[PDB]
Amino acid sequence: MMINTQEDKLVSAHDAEEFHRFFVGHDSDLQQEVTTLLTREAHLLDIQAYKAWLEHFVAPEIKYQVISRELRSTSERRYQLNDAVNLYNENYQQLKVRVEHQMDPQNWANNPKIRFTRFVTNVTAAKDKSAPEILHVRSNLILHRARRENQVDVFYATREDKWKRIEGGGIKLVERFVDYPERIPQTHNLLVFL
């Protein structure tokens, strides 16, 4: 099933082809495998096992990217300056640094221990048509972060991932991309692993 972007005036060419990708790529076995993968990943992050996540779930070649897109007019084509800022755009070393900041006993923000709860839904998956070891994964996330008695922040995101099968049976993240839907988050910060 395909989208006609001449008639469907709100749909980007990018989103239309992604939709088609995931439509034709449906596989029942893959759906259950990837659902399990993302549930394990989310559990690991919720209990703040960041080193285990980085070592076991994230590939050396990782690009971990979360953008905030400047709001532009749908009819203003002429202005061509970069429309996206990278809230995250991290390689493995950069994730390592963030992880080591997280568990340092002198990270004042982490005391008392913060509470995370992740809700992963709408999982879809498709094997890459060229590189069959690559799995394209889409999933939606609600992330609840609570701390300091009465601070509550709720994040909402669609994660567009590429995962890679590893020798031995593991699966590791090689790219995560999030186009964060709120231009100005009202959450104090976005210092969470989406």
Binding site: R72, R98, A109
Partner: protein, 437 residues
């Protein structure tokens, strides 16, 4: 509003960070009167380019004119007061109101009115209904500021002694570019809490950011735990008549960036430093590749080196919309420019691992300013007090011999108090006659 700040800006009432009525008063006496950062040439480089900006709580459209100049207008239709523009940036030769269809030029003039001939006739004078214009627009080496008060000093005079410190990076380095779009996030803190931190808080780096220093191995690791001063020396801090101030940490061109940024950045800065020394001298060439942290009064802050440009946009007494840009030197390789832009967000953007540390400093200070008993506690800005100088042969303004110091807090809050106790620029000037003495 008198005596919220003590003489020489030595102490401040905590309440200033939480009082609702004072916030309203600031809109009348800080934000209505002072120069406020809008955008950089490089974000509106072509005719018709525009950005939205905030000036205090108000929103303005900042537009590149056909003749190459820049004008700015309140983002409000002159008919029934609908917001005119909803995009954050773009290109247009005019702006049409979605309510009834009034069309304005990029010069703010009311050009088209639906049913003008049929229903208005001479009941309308379009020449009287142009967008409300910001009367003062000036720039400092591409950085464009606006002011609602036609009586304000010229921007260059307003920067006062601070300009000398800014020039090596801003003027003499071959031009800067502001890299958009900015990171934007809302933080539950008063705008002043950020402004004071950036104007002079070298003291917090080693303590607040201890974990970040260990993890990223920034050059600032030298002051980790507030155990030792930098091997390069204590640095400098300065302040100026109209409240702008900054610290200087010698040689720290990579600033709050992690180890992976250091070699390439340091090499770039050292190379230009050698060229600059011959044009502007050794000391100022060194300033070029040093870390400056400062605030351009009231609510625009910056870091050089780890090149950041910030606006603390007030929402209410306990709420600020924080904007974070990177800036780059125009002659940097394009790959280095991209790396710098990402590294700024990585440390101090909405998902910045340093900026996160700061949230609770800023937010709890502001929340304590709201509480009845706690609001009467004084903040103290005594670091370096009694040792500041004026009229030094080399370093202009009121200057202390440490970037870990509160020289610039004192100047910031002196100017602040002078403004809140004044009705206009003339009164501010009278209240500031002996600012350096």
């Amino acid at each position: 509003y008198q005596n919220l700040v003590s003489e020489a800006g030595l102490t401040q009432k905590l309440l200033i960070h939480g009082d609702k009525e004072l916030f309203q008063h600031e809109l009348k006496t800080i934000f209505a009167r002072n120069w406020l950062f809008l955008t950089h040439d490089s974000l509106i480089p072509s005719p018709g380019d525009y950005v939205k900006a905030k000036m205090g709580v108000d929103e303005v459209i900042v537009s590149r004119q056909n003749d190459g100049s820049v004008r700015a207008f309140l983002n409000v239709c002159r008919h029934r007061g609908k917001t005119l523009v909803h995009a954050e940036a773009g290109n247009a030769k005019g702006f049409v109101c979605g309510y009834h269809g009034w069309g304005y030029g990029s010069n703010g003039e009311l050009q088209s009115v639906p049913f003008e001939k049929e229903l208005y006739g001479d009941a309308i004078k379009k020449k009287c209904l142009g967008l409300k214009e910001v009367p003062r627009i000036e720039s400092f080496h591409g950085f464009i500021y606006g002011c609602f008060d036609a009586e304000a000093p010229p921007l260059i005079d307003y920067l006062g002694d601070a300009a000398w410190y800014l020039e090596p990076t801003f003027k003499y380095s071959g031009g800067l570019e502001l890299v958009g779009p900015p990171g934007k996030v809302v933080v539950k803190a008063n705008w002043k809490s950020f402004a004071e931190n950036f104007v002079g808080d070298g003291y917090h780096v080693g303590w607040t950011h201890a974990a970040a220093l260990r993890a990223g191995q920034s050059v600032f690791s030298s002051i980790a735990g507030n155990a030792k001063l930098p091997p390069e020396g204590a640095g400098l801090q300065m302040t100026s008549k109209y409240g702008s101030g900054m610290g200087v940490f010698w040689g720290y061109y990579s600033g709050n960036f992690s180890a992976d940024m250091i070699p390439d950045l340091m090499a770039f800065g050292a190379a230009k430093q050698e060229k600059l020394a011959k044009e502007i001298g050794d000391v100022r060439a060194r300033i070029y590749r040093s870390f400056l942290n400062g605030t351009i009064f009231p609510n625009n802050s910056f870091l050089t080196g780890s090149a950041a440009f910030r606006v603390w946009n007030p929402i209410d007494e306990n709420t600020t919309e924080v904007w974070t840009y990177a800036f780059v030197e125009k002659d940097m390789p394009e790959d280095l420019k991209r790396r710098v832009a990402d590294a700024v967000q990585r440390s101090i953007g909405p998902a910045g691992f340093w900026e996160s540390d700061d949230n609770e400093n800023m937010e709890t200070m502001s929340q304590n300013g709201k509480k009845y008993q706690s609001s009467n506690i004084d903040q103290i800005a005594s670091l370096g007090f009694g040792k500041d100088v004026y009229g030094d042969e080399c370093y202009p303004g009121v200057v202390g011999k440490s970037a870990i110091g509160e020289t610039s807090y004192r100047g910031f809050y002196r100017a602040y108090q002078a403004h809140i106790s004044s009705s206009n620029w003339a009164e501010f000037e009278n209240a500031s006659r002996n600012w350096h003495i």
